Design a protein around this ligand. Structure first.
Ligand SMILES: CN(C)c1ccc2c(c1)Oc1cc(NCCCCCCNC(=O)c3ccc(C(=O)C4=C(O)CCCC4=O)c([N+](=O)[O-])c3)c3ccccc3c1N2
Ligand SMILES: CN(C)c1ccc2c(c1)Oc1cc(NCCCCCCNC(=O)c3ccc(C(=O)C4=C(O)CCCC4=O)c([N+](=O)[O-])c3)c3ccccc3c1N2
Ligand SMILES: [Co+2]
Ligand SMILES: [Co+2]
Lengths: 383, 383
């Protein structure tokens, strides 16, 4: 059931913005670890005396890394005279965010038809405003409302190149790395209470609950009309045998925030080969792999979708596989991206639901809680 | 003239500590860019609820990257019950340092015979105390005094593995990168006034002025008894044709601080080949190279030290060459390590002064201000 109840026209995920202490070092690490190219900048060299912002791209995926300069560089400016390229930026907010949460996502940005209308309708329907609509060079409109914690939902609309005031990066600085990542599939938040978080966000967006076909969490997914903007939300389940990883997140993050970004790959085998080669030389580490019993059990579950050789490749790379009634999901998770056990990344590829591929084909891997738990108990028995 | 006036026994540079917002991302970037191996850690996985600290090593060079966790994790601790492995660490000081200065060096650490004696003698001779001597696991003593700005001189002494409470890193996480860097040669501070800075530091150390054989700075070098701990200090010269880069540093850093670290390489050609290959894939960028006229002029200046092929290799890599009356220096400078135009790195190799090599052989490259200026004017004439 998809009631198509979006209260304004939503296109696709546009970018994700990380708030950093040093944008340069985070952006360079992420570029090498994920195979993303340096594509635009806004910093002292472009006249921005307020913040340093570096944009990485891979296909349609856009990661923005922003850090504040000394406020003394811009102390004489006011908002009408600002040199910041992102008018919602505030030195105090950014330093407070980073001190509270450490490295993490500040903005989940979606492209809409009209960001001023999206903002007005959202606030009329309960959204807490964060930054009012601002028109940049008569060409782009940006507005922000609160999503959860200190994460904002950012609306961007284009009259017709990332943002005005950003410059394309020199060819020499822009090495054409590419490990196969192509777009953001979903972005997941952790909150203390799922019910009120869903009511709030669905209330101001009109996003509907996406259908899904004891492990420490309850979750639900909100989706746009064509189900290409997907926003899962998790809450902890307390009193469990093992402590909820959602609760550990909330403790180390100092509250609600973005838990993981799932990045679609056009070739998950190539992406993981390339990422795993770089894990110990500046890139990202991956969670420990399932036992061999998990891959032996894959034949019964997805033997009509993957060949034995393709299953063997999943085992080589530690890929997890899940299936719903409509399609199949290949997924794997990194270790946390920074110092705190908070945000991490998921790499995914979806098989099926061809009509274009429909959004969320194969689900989100909820079946892998039980399948991994069974295979580890079975591997103890094998031993 | 070397009066050997050290007021306590000093051995060698021991480590450099960076204060970061996210230690993981800075350490991974530096590891890949400089070819340093992950060698020790102190973090949540080792029981440290206060700070994350990651140690990189290349030869005898040790870089420590430290960032604070949420204070809530350790809110019930007091100094007698702390889980921090570096007892001088303070959440507030670290956040204040990073907000003020951005990514940069907090501590220049030297190994001494007795850190408690070094501390006591230094303070008796005018040093401003920063952290009193603390004995760690009855095995290592650490103490800190102010050096300049918010940079401290850290004394470490060992009864007889980096520090107690640090753990060696897993072989899988510890890829054996090595681009040829072997030790810290010198560490340079920028201050508003050179005279009072030299009087203060030489006053409490007994370090002597190291002999040197219009461009925006005045500088002097302080040296230990065997001239293996070398601490140059720069001040701006105002009213110049081009604005002093020392003054630009002071503005963007919010005052005095560490300007550059010079890292000795056992094979500067290999080091720069390896570093330049990685500049656009997560590593470090280098300053623009001298014009060909500079390398043509090298024959007259160092043609008795370097062959034509060795000079051609310097030209390929953009290496600068300088000479004093005792030896020859090969050097090159990176672009700033982070967002702000503040700290950068120098790679150096010294030729001559064999007796071991004596410290500071060939000087610090002061002759390269005029030689680069002449060669750029000459290259305009060639054109
Ligand atoms: C000493 N000795 C030798 C030893 C002794 C005893 C044990 C032992 C060793 O061994 C173990 C190992 C464990 N460890 C197994 C780890 C299982 C956790 C698997 C998580 N699995 C996912 O598959 C998943 C899927 C989707 C999403 C995802 O993306 C997503 C969304 O997008 C939206 C909707 C919500 C959502 O979750 C996400 N995710 O992270 O978000 C994750 C144990 C665990 C529990 C109890 C005992 C254990 C034991 N006994
Ligand atoms: C438009 N159009 C086409 C154009 C027009 C006009 C010009 C033009 C183009 O072109 C240029 C280029 C310039 N740019 C040349 C840059 C020269 C700077 C070289 C710095 N050179 C070092 O060699 C060094 C050595 C040692 C240490 C070091 O390590 C150290 C220590 O360890 C301890 C002691 C102190 C110390 O310094 C360090 N260092 O950074 O610390 C550094 C100009 C500059 C000035 C005026 C006009 C310029 C021009 N006209
Ligand atoms: Co997911
Ligand atoms: Co130098």
């Amino acid at each position: 059931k998809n009631p198509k109840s979006d209260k304004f026209k939503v296109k696709r995920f546009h970018h994700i913005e990380f708030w950093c202490g040093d944008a340069t070092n985070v952006a360079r690490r992420f570029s090498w670890g994920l195979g993303m190219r340096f594509s635009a900048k806004s910093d002292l060299s472009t006249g921005n005396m307020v913040h340093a912002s570096y944009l990485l791209t891979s296909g349609d995926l856009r990661f923005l890394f922003t850090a504040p300069y000394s406020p003394s560089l811009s102390a004489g400016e006011i908002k009408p005279t600002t040199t910041a390229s992102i008018p919602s930026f505030d030195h105090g907010s950014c330093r407070s965010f980073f001190s509270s949460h450490g490295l993490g996502v500040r903005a989940v940005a979606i492209e809409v038809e009209d960001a001023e209308s999206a903002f007005s309708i959202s606030v009329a329907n309960g959204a807490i405003p964060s930054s009012p609509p601002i028109v940049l060079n008569e060409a782009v409109t940006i507005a922000e409302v609160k999503l959860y914690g200190d994460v904002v939902l950012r609306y961007v609309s284009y009259k017709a190149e990332f943002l005005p005031g950003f410059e394309r990066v020199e060819d020499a600085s822009s090495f054409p790395l590419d490990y196969g990542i192509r777009r953001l599939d979903h972005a997941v938040g952790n909150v203390p209470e799922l019910g009120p978080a869903l009511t709030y966000v669905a209330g101001f967006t009109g996003f509907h609950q996406f259908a899904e076909f004891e492990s420490g969490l309850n979750s639900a997914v909100l989706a746009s009309n064509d189900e290409m903007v997907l926003l899962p939300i998790n809450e902890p389940v307390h009193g469990t045998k093992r402590k909820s990883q959602i609760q550990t997140y909330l403790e180390h993050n100092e509250g609600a925030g973005l838990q993981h970004l799932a990045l679609m790959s056009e070739d998950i085998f190539r992406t993981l080969r390339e990422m795993r080669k770089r894990s110990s030389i500046g890139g990202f580490d991956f969670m420990p792999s399932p036992p061999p019993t998990y891959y032996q059990n894959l034949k019964k579950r997805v033997g009509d979708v993957l060949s034995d050789d393709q299953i063997k490749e999943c085992e080589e790379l530690g890929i997890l596989v899940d299936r719903d009634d409509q399609g199949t999901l290949l997924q794997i998770f990194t270790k946390p991206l920074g110092d705190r056990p908070t945000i991490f990344i998921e790499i995914i590829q979806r098989v099926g639901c061809m009509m274009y591929q429909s959004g969320g084909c194969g689900g989100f891997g909820k079946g892998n809680f039980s399948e991994l738990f069974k295979s580890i108990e079975e591997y103890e028995k094998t031993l």
